[PDB]
Coordinates of C-alpha atoms and ligand atoms in Angstrom, one line a residue:
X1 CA -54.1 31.9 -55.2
X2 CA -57.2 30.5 -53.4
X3 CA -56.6 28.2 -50.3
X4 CA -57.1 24.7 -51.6
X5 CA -58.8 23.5 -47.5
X6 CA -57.9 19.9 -47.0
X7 CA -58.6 17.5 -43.8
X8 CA -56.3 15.0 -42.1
X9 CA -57.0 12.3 -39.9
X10 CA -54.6 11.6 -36.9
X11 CA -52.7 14.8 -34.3
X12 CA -51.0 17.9 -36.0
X13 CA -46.8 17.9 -36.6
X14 CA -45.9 20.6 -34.2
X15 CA -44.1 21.6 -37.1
X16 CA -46.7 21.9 -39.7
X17 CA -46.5 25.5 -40.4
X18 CA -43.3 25.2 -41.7
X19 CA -44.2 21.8 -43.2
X20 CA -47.1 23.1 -45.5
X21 CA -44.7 26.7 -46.2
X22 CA -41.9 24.0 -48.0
X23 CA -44.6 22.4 -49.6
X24 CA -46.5 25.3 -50.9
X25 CA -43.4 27.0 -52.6
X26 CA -43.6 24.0 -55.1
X27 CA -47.6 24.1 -54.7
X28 CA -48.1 27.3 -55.7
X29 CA -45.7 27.9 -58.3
X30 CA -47.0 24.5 -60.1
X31 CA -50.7 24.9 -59.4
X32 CA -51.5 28.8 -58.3
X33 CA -53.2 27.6 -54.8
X34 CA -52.2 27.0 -51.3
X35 CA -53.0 24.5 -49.4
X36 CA -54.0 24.4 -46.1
X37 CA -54.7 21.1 -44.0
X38 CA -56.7 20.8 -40.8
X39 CA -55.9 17.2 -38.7
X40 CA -59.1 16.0 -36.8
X41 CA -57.6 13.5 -34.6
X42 CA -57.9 9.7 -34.2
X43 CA -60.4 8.8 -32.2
X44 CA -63.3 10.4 -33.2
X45 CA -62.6 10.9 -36.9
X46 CA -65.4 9.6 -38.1
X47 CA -68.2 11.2 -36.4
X48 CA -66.3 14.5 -37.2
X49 CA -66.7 13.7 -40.8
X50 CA -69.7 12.7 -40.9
X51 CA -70.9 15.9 -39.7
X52 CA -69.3 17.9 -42.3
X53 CA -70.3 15.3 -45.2
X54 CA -73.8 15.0 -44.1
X55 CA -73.8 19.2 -43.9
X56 CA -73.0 19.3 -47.2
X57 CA -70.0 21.9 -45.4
X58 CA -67.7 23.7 -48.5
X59 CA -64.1 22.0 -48.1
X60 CA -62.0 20.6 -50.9
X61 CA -60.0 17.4 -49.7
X62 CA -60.3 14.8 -47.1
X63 CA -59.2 12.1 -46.2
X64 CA -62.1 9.7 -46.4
X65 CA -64.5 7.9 -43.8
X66 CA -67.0 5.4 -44.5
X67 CA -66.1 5.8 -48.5
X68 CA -68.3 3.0 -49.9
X69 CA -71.4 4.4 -47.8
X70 CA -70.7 7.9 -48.4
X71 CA -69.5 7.7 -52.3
X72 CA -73.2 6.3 -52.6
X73 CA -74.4 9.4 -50.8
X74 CA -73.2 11.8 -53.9
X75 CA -70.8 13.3 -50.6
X76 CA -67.7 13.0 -53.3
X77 CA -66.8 14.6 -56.4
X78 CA -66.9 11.9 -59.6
X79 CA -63.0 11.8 -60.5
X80 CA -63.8 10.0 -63.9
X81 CA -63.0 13.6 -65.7
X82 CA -60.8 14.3 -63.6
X83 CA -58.5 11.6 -64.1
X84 CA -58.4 12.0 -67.8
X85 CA -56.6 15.5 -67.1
X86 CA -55.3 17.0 -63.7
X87 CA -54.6 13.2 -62.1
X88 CA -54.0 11.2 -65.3
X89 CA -49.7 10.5 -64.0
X90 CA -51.0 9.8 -60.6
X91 CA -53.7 7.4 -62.0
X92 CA -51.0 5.5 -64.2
X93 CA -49.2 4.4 -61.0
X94 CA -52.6 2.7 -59.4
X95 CA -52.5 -1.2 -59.8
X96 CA -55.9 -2.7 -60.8
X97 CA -57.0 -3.8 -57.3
X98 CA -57.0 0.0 -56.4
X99 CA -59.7 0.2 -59.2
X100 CA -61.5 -2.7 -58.4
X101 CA -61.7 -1.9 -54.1
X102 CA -63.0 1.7 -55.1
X103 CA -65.0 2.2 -57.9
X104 CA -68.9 2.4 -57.1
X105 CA -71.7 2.0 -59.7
X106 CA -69.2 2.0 -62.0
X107 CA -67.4 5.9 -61.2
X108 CA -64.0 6.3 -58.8
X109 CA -64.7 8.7 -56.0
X110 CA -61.1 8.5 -54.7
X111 CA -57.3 9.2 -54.7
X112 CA -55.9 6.2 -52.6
X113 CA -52.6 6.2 -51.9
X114 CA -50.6 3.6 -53.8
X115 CA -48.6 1.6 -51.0
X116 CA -49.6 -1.3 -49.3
X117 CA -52.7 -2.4 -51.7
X118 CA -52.2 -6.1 -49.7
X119 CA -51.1 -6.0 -46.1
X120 CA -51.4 -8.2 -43.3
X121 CA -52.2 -7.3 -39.5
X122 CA -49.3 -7.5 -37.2
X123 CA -48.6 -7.6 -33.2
X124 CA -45.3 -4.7 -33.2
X125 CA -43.5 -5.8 -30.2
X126 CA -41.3 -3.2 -28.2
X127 CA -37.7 -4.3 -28.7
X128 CA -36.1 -1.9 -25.7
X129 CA -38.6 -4.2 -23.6
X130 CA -38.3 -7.6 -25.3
X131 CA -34.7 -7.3 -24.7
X132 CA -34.7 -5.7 -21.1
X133 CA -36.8 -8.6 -19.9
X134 CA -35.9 -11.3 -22.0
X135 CA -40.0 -11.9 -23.3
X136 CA -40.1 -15.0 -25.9
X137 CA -42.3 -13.8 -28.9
X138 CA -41.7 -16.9 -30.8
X139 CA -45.2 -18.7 -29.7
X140 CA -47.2 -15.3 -30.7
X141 CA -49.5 -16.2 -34.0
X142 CA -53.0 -15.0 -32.7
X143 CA -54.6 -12.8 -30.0
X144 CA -54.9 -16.2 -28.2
X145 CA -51.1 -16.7 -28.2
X146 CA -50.4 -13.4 -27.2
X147 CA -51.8 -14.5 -23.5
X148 CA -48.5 -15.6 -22.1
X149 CA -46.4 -12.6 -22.7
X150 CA -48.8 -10.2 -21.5
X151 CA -48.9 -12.2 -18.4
X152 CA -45.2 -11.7 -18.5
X153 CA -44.7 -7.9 -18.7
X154 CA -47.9 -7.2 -16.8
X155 CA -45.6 -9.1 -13.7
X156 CA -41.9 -8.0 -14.6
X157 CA -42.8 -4.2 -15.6
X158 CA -46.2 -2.5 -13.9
X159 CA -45.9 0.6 -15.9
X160 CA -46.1 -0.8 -19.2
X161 CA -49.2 -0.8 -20.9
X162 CA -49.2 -4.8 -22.0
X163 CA -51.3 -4.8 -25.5
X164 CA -51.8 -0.7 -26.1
X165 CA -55.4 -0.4 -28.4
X166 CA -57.6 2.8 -28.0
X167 CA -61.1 3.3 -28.7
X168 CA -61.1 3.2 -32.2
X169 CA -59.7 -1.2 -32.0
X170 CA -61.7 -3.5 -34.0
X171 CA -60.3 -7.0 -33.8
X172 CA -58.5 -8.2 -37.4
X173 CA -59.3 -11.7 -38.9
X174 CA -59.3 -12.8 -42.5
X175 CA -62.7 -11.2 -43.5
X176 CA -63.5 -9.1 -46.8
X177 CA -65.8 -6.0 -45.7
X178 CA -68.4 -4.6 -48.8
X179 CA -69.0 -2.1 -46.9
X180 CA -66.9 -1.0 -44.5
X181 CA -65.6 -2.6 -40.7
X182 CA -67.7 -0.2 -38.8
X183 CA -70.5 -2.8 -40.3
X184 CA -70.6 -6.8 -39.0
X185 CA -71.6 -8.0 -42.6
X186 CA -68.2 -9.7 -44.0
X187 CA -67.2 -12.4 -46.7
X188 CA -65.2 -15.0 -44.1
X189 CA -62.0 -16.0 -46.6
X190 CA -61.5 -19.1 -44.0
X191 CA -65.1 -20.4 -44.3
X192 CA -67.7 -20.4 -47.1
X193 CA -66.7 -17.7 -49.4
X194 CA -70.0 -17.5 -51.1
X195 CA -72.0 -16.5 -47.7
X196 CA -72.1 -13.0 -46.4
X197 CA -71.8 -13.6 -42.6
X198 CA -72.2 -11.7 -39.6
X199 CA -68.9 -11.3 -37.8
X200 CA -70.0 -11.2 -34.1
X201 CA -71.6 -15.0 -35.5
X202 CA -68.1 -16.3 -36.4
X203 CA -66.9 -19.0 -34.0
X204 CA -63.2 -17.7 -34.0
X205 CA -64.2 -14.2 -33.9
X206 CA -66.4 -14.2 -31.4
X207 CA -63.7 -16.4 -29.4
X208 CA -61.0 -13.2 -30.2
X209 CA -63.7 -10.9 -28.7
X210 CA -63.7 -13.3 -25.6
X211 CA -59.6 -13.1 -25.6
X212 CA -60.0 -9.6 -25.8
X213 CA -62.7 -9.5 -23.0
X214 CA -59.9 -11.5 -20.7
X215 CA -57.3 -9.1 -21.4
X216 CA -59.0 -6.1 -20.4
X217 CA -60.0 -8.2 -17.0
X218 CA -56.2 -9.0 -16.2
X219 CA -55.2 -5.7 -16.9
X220 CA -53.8 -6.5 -20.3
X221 CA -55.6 -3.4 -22.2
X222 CA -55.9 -0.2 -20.4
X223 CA -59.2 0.1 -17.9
X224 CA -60.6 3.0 -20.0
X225 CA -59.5 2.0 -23.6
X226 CA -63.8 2.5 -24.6
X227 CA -63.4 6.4 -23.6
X228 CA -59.6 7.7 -23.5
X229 CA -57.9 10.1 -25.8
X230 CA -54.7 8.7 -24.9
X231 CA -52.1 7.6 -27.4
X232 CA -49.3 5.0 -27.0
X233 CA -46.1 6.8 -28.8
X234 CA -44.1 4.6 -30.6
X235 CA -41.0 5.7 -29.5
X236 CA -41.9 5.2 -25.8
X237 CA -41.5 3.0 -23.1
X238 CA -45.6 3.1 -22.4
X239 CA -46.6 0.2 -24.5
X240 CA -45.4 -3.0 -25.1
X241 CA -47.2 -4.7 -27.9
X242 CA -49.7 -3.2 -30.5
X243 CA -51.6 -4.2 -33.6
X244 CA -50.4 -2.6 -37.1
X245 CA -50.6 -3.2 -40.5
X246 CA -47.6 -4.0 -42.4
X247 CA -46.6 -4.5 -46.1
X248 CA -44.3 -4.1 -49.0
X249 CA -44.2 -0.1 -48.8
X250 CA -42.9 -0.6 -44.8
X251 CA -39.8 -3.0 -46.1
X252 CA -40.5 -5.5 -43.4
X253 CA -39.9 -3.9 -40.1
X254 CA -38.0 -1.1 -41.0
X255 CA -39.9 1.2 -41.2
X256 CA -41.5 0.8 -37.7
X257 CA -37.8 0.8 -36.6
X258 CA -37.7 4.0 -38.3
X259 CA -40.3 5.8 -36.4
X260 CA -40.0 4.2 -33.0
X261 CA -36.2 4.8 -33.3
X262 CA -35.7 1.4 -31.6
X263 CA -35.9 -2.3 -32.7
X264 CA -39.4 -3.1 -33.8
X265 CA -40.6 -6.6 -34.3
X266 CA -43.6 -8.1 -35.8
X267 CA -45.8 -11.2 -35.6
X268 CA -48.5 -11.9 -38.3
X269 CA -51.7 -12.5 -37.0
X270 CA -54.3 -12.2 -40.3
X271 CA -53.0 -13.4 -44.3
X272 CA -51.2 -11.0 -46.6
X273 CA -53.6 -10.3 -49.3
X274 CA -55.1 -7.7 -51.3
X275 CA -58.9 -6.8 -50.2
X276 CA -61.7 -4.5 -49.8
X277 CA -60.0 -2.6 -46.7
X278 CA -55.8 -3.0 -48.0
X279 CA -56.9 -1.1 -51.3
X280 CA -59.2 1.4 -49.4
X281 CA -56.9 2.5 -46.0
X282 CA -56.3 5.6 -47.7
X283 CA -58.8 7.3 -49.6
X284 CA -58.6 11.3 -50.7
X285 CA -61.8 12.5 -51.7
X286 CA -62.9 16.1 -53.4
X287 CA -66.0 17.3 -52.2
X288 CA -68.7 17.5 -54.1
X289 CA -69.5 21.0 -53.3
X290 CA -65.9 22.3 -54.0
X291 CA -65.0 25.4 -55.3
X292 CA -61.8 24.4 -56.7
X293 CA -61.9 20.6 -58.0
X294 CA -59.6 21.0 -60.4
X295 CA -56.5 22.5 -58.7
X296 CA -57.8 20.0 -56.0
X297 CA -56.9 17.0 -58.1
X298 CA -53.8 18.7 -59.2
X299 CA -52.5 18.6 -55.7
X300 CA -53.0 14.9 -55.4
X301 CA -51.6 14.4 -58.1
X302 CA -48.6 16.6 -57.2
X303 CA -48.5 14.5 -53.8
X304 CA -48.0 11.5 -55.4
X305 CA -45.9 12.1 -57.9
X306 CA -43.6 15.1 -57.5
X307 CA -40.9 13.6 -54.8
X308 CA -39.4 16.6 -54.0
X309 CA -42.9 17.3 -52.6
X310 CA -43.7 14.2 -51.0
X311 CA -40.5 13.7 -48.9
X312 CA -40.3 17.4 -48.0
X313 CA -43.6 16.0 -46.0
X314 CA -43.2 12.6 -44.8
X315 CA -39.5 13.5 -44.0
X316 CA -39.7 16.5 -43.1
X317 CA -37.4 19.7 -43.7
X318 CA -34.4 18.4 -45.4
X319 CA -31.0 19.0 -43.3
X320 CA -32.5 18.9 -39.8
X321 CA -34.7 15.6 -40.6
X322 CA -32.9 14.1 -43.0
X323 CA -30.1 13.9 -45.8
X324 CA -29.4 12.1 -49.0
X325 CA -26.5 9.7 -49.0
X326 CA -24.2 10.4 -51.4
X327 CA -23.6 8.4 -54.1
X328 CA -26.7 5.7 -53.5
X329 CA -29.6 6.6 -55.6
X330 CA -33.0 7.1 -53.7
X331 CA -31.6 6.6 -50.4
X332 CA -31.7 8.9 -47.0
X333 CA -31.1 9.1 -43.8
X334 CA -33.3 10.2 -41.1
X335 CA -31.0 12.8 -38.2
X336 CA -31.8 14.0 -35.1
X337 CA -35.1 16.7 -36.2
X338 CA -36.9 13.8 -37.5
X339 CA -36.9 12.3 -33.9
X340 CA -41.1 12.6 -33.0
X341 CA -44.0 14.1 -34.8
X342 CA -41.9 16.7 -36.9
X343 CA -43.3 15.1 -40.2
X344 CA -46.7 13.2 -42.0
X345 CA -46.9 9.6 -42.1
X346 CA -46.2 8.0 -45.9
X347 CA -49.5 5.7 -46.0
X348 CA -52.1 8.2 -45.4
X349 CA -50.3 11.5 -47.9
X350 CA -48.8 10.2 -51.1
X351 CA -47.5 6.8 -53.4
X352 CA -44.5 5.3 -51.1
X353 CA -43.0 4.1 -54.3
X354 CA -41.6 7.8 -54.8
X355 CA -40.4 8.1 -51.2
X356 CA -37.2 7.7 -50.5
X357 CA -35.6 4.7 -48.9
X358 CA -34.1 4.9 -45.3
X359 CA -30.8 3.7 -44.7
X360 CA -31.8 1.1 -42.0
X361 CA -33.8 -0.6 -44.8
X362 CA -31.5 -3.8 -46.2
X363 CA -31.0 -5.3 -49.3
X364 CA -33.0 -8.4 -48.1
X365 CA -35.9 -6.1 -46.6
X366 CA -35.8 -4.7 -50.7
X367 CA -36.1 -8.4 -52.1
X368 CA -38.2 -9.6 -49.7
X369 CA -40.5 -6.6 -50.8
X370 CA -40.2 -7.2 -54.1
X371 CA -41.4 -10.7 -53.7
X372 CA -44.4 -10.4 -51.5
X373 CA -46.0 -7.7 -54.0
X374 CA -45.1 -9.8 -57.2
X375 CA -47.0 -12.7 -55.4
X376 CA -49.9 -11.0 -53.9
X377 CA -53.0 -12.8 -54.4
X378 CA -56.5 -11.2 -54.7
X379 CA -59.7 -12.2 -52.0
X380 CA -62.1 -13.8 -53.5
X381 CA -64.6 -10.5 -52.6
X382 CA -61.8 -8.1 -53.9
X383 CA -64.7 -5.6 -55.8
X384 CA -68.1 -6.6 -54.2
X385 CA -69.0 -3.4 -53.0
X386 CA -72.9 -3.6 -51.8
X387 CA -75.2 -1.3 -53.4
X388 CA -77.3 0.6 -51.0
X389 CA -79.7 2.0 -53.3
X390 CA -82.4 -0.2 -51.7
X391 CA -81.4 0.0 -48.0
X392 CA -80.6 3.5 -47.4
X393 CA -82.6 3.9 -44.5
X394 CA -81.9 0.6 -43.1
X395 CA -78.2 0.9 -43.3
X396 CA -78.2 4.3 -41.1
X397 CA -80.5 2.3 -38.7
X398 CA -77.7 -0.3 -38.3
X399 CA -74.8 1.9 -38.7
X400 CA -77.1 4.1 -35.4
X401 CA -77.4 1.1 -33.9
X402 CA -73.7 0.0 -34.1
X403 CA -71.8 3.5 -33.3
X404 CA -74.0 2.8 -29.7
X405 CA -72.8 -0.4 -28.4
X406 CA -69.7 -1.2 -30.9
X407 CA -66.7 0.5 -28.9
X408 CA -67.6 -1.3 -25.5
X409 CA -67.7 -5.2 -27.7
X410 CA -64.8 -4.2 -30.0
X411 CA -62.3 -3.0 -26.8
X412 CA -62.9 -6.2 -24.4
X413 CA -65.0 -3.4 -22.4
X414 CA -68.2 -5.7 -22.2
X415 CA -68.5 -9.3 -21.7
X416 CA -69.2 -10.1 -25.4
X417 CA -71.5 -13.2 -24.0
X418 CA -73.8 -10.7 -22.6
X419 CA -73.5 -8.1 -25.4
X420 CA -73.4 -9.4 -28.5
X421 CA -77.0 -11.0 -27.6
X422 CA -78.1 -7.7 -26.7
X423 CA -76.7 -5.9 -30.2
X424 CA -78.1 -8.6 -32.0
X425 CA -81.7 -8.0 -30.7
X426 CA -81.3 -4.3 -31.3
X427 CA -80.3 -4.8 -34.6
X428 CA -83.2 -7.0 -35.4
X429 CA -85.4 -5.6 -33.6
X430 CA -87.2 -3.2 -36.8
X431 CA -86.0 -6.1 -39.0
X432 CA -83.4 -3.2 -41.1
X433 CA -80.6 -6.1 -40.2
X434 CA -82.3 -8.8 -41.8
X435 CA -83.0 -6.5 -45.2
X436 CA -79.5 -5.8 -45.4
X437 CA -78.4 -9.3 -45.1
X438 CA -80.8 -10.4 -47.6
X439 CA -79.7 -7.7 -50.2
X440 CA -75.8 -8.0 -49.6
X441 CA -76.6 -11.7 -49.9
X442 CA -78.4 -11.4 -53.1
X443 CA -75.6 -8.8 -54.8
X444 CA -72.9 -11.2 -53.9
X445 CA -74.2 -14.2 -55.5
X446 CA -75.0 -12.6 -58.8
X447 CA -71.0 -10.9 -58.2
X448 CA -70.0 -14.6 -58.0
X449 CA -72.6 -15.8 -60.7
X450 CA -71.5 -13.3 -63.6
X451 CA -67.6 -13.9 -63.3
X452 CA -68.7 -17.7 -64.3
X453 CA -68.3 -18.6 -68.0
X454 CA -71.5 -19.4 -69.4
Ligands
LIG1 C1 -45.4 3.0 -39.8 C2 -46.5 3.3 -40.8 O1 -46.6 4.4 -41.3 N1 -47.3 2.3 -41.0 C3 -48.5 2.4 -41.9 C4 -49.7 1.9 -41.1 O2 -49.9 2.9 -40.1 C5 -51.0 1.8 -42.1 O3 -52.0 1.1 -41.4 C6 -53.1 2.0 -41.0 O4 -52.7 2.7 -39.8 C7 -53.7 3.7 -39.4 C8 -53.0 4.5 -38.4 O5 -52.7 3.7 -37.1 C9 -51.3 3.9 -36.7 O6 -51.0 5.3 -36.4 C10 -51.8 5.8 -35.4 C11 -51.3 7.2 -35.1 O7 -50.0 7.0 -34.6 C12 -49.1 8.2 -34.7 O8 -49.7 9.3 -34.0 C13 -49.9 9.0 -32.6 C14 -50.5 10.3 -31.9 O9 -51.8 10.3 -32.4 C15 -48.6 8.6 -32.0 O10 -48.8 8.1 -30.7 C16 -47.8 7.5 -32.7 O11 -46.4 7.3 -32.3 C17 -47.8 7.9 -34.2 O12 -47.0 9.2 -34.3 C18 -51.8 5.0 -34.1 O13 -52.6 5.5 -33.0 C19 -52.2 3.5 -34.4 O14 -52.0 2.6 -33.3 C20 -53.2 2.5 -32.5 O15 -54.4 2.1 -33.2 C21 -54.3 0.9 -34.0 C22 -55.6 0.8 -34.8 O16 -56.7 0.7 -33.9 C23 -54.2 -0.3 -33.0 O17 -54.0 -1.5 -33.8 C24 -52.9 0.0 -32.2 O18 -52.6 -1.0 -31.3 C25 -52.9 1.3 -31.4 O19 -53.9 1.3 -30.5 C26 -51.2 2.9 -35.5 O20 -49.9 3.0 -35.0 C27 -54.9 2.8 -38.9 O21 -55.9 3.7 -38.5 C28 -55.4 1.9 -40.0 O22 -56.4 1.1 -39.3 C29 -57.5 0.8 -40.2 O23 -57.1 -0.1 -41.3 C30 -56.7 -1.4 -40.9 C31 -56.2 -2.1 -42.1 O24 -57.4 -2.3 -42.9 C32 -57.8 -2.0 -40.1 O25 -57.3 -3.3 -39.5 C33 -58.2 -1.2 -38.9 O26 -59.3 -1.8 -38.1 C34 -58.6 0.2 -39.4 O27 -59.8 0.2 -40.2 C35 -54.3 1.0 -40.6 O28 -53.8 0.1 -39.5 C36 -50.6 0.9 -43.3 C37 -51.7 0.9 -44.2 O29 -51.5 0.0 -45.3 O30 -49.5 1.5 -44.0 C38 -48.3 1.5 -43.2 O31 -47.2 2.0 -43.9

């Protein structure tokens, strides 16, 4: 039985010995491998994986960075075979935008997890402290709005961290990304959505990055959110709002409930919709250089469709985490072991549509659902993903270029007014910006021009 060796972003459960044993008695019987994952934490997932990509280092799953970039790179292994065989039950569940958000030149390079393929950006409030201080959410629709109750909890509870982001933060609007949103290039779905645009250019953007700016002066967003390794647990007092994504998989704000073991509640702040990033928030990839592709795809599949598997991980040991309840089909509830990081998180390890449903999710949480994926509309940029083949060396001048002053713009860090001029002249400086632009510009009008009848 060889070691199938996966990676995970995010911290390790402290129980994750015991986690991967439960798993791999179904694993090995069904497949004859065991797997083994290694978690690479949040904040600096991406240049860890970039180093083992661009080494060319043996491993056999990941959980993807910088897919549409790296796919182009020949870092992944081409699923199309492997679909037809070892992942063709986990393919069938996949609906079309999955296919259209990652398919490059033509060929899938990833196992995305089928959940939330559209999903809007949220402020999750913390209910212990809404209600302990009596804080009026009703007024929050935009980083803008949020203003007043920061203000508030800043003055009634020092401790709290007002609005909790880390290092990784990149403000949320309603953009399409063809590459990725470690890039600036976006399709703006409020402005002209035939123009690729740069972000740190749009008006209301560029006002969020001045919000954001504000927030870290009055204390709003810790003093070291560009450097710290420090995470905000959701089940503690430390934070009071934060930004997450939310849809139909989640069943409102259950689920956040759920895993904060308190009253969660949300405020949109960006459109539900399906788009580049909602279809691509998950992506398992095979290396290229694997030893063991096929068993590799047989264990995705397994994780996404075997649900004895599935919930054994995002659960967590049956009996101490959690119990079915008798006589309701498909429905659990969560006891005392499943209090804290005792299990995996559903969006980034298998299809939530085989997960079982908690018992603080209601009937109306199940309609309401229902009806936001049956009316899920598509951007308009769903599926352009940019070619790089002519801008391979400009796009890891930008992407260089980016990784160096992003963190400090992105966080509030840096008065944007005096940085985003100064990224802007970097960027431009060897003209690789301006090629990029051009090229993006140029795919995306013959995107547009080819899905007109003639
Ligand atoms: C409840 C649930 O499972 N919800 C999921 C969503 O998580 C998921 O959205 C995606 O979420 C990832 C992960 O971010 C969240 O989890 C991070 C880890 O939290 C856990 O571990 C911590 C210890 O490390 C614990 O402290 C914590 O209790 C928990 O155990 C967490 O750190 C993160 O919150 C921080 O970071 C976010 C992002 O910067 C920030 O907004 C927060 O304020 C906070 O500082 C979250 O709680 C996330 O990485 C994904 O982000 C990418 O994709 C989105 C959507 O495109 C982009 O906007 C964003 O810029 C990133 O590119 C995404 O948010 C959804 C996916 O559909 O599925 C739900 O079911």
């Amino acid at each position: 039985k060889p070691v199938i060796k996966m990676y995970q972003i995010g911290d390790k459960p402290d129980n994750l010995d015991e986690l991967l044993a439960n798993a791999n008695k179904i694993i090995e019987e069904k497949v004859g491998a065991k797997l083994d994952i290694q978690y690479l934490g949040w904040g600096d997932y991406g240049k860890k994986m970039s180093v083992i990509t661009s080494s060319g280092e043996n491993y056999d799953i990941a959980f993807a960075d910088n897919y549409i970039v790296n796919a182009q790179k020949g870092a992944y292994a081409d699923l199309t075979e492997l679909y037809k065989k070892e992942g063709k039950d986990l393919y069938k569940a996949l609906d079309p935008a999955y296919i259209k958000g990652n398919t490059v030149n033509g060929k899938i390079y990833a196992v995305p997890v089928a959940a939330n393929v559209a999903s809007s950006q949220n402020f999750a409030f913390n209910g212990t402290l809404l209600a302990k201080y009596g804080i009026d959410i009703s007024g929050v629709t935009s980083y803008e709005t949020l203003e007043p109750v920061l203000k508030q909890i800043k003055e009634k509870a020092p401790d709290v961290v007002p609005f909790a982001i880390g290092k990784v933060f990149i403000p949320s609007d309603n953009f399409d990304y063809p590459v990725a949103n470690g890039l600036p290039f976006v399709i703006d779905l409020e402005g002209d959505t035939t123009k690729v645009v740069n972000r740190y250019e749009v008006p209301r953007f560029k006002e969020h990055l001045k919000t954001l700016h504000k927030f870290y002066e009055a204390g709003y967003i810790p003093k070291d959110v560009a450097t710290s390794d420090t995470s905000f647990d959701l089940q503690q007092d430390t934070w009071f709002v934060r930004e997450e994504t939310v849809g139909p998989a989640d069943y409102g704000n259950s689920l956040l409930s759920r895993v904060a073991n308190k009253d969660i509640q949300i405020k949109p702040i960006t459109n539900f919709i399906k788009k580049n990033q909602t279809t691509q928030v998950a992506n398992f990839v095979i290396s290229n250089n694997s030893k063991n592709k096929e068993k590799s795809m047989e264990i995705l599949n397994l994780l996404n469709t075997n649900p004895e598997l599935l919930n054994g991980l995002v659960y967590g040991p049956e009996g101490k985490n959690w119990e079915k309840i008798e006589g309701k089909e498909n429905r659990v509830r969560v006891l005392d072991g499943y209090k804290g990081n005792t299990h995996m998180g559903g969006w980034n390890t298998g299809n939530n549509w085989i997960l079982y449903i908690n018992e603080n999710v209601t009937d109306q949480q199940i309609e309401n659902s229902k009806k936001e994926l049956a009316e899920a509309k598509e951007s308009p940029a769903l599926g352009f993903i940019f070619n790089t083949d002519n801008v391979k060396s400009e796009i890891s001048a930008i992407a260089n270029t980016m990784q160096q002053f992003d963190t400090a713009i992105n966080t509030g860090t840096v008065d944007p007014d005096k940085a985003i001029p100064e990224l802007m002249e970097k960027l431009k400086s060897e003209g690789a910006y301006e090629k990029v632009l051009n090229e993006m510009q140029k795919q995306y009008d013959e995107f547009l021009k080819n899905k007109k009848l003639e």
